[PDB]
């Protein structure tokens, strides 16, 4: 496959690398507070982990959209892929287990820590859009399980925390009309890329090219070069996936595949 892609590339033909769980998302565990205050007791925002082939996102409202325009709080997460992915099989699940337990979280500047006490509500009006050049290529509304994104470079996950119009006494007890808010309403989304096709080389969960290149570089204490991050670290490499980096990475991955035939 790698030599085939090399020869196709040399002739400027459509190249294709098939990846099982492509490592396309640089690691990032971040949050955005659309509403916040120094004591961090009435917070509205989103927290996400983008790691490898996985995106877990969660929108939290501490007031549970009590004062929202229609008791709806809209959350949006945009993930820009450094390369175009095609023929992608994607598992989409309602909840984000990673942001569904109590947490103590550093403030954006690290000056203080705030408390997160999620109570998971079902996401409402889930719209997953797979965009190419800003145009909508694939749309999935309220669809969960396996979906297909045929050609895309951006993912837009829109979801809503909707206040339940009817609550049992316990549920109504969780969400008061005003502060303090002891239980914070959280909606989630999990998005795993099981398989995909990319015109560029990527690290994945099945091939060992990145491991081979990194192992060879570490075994012989190769000084940092002008192209790759100073550990062969994948997050830095995929964050700043320049054309020069892509060329060098394709070269070294092809050579690693050649070596793996014998070693």
């Amino acid at each position: 496959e790698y030599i085939e892609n090399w020869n196709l590339q040399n002739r400027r033909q459509r190249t294709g690398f098939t990846f099982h769980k492509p490592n396309i998302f640089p690691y990032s565990a971040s949050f955005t507070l659309n509403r916040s205050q120094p004591a961090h007791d009435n917070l509205m925002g989103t927290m996400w982990l983008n790691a490898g082939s996985e995106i877990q996102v969660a929108g939290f409202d501490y007031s549970c959209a009590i004062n929202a325009p229609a008791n709806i709080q809209q959350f949006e997460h945009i993930v820009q892929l450094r390369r175009v992915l095609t023929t992608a099989t994607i598992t989409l699940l309602p909840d984000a287990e990673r942001f569904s337990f109590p947490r103590v979280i550093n403030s954006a500047d690290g000056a203080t820590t705030w408390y997160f006490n999620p109570v998971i509500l079902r996401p409402n009006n889930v719209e997953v859009e797979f965009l190419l050049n800003g145009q909508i290529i694939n749309t999935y509304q309220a669809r969960f399980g396996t979906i297909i994104a045929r050609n895309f470079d951006t993912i837009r996950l829109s979801f809503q925390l909707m206040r339940p119009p009817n609550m049992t006494p316990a549920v109504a007890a969780l969400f008061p009309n005003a502060q303090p808010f002891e239980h914070h309403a959280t909606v989630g989304l999990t998005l795993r890329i099981e398989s995909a096709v990319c015109e560029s080389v990527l690290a994945d969960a099945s091939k060992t090219m990145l491991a081979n290149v990194t192992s060879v570089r570490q075994e012989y204490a190769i000084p940092v070069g002008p192209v790759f991050p100073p550990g062969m670290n994948w997050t830095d490499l995929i964050t700043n996936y320049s054309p020069s980096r892509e060329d060098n990475l394709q070269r070294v991955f092809t050579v690693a595949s050649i070596r793996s035939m014998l070693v």
């Binding site: 565990a29 955005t32 954006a108 008061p176």
Partner: protein, 276 residues
Amino acid sequence: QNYGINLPITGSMDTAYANSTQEETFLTSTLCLYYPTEAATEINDNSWKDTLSQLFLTKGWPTGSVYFKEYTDIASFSVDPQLYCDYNVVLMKYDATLQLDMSELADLILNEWLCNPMDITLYYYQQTDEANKWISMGSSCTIKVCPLNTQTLGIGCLTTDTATFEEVATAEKLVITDVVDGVNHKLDVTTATCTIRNCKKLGPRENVAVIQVGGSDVLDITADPTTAPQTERMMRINWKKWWQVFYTVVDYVNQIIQAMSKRSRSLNSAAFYYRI
């Protein structure tokens, strides 16, 4: 710098923790203690404020940073309280006969209130939402209410005849009136000795803590019957001597300030939202 707009802040879930800022906060901030006169009477010491300032100095507060403000009783203090220090602690003695008065006082100082004028003579007033209340303060507040109907005629009352008005406050130093929302009301208030304001509960007042000296948990800072929250700023201690109470306040001032945060409305970031 960008004051009138609410801009989202993005943070990484793994950045770091900065060092403790407690020492610097104590150095650059002021502490106010509010206590009843009977506390000073029982202590019966002329220089006790100096001793407390020295003890606070042992806890890292620079001399002159801590202030001690006397008030006669809960009712008198409830008349337009003015808490101006960076950090405010109010020692409120528990009286089983004044449960609602203490509740109203705490609701007034433990919450942030945005108040507009009320001209009961000119206008009829509604309460729009759950956060809308009518807070009246003065030497003696007596509020009587006549609920109207869609035709402006009173329900169980005559607009012209105040004698039929339904009394909701009598000789109150402070009273927070909650009436049915969406219903116009004619108000009769003793304007000579009482001013009434149409107030909205914005949210918690972070930099005010109330330490209840005495009985059980009775404060209800929420007008909603279904909820009686006990926030971390509503402390409660058992006591027999006031010197013990003040020693406890000084010894655990770290925890008391930890339960409090800088008034969100009192810093430059609040500029052009409401105040500074």
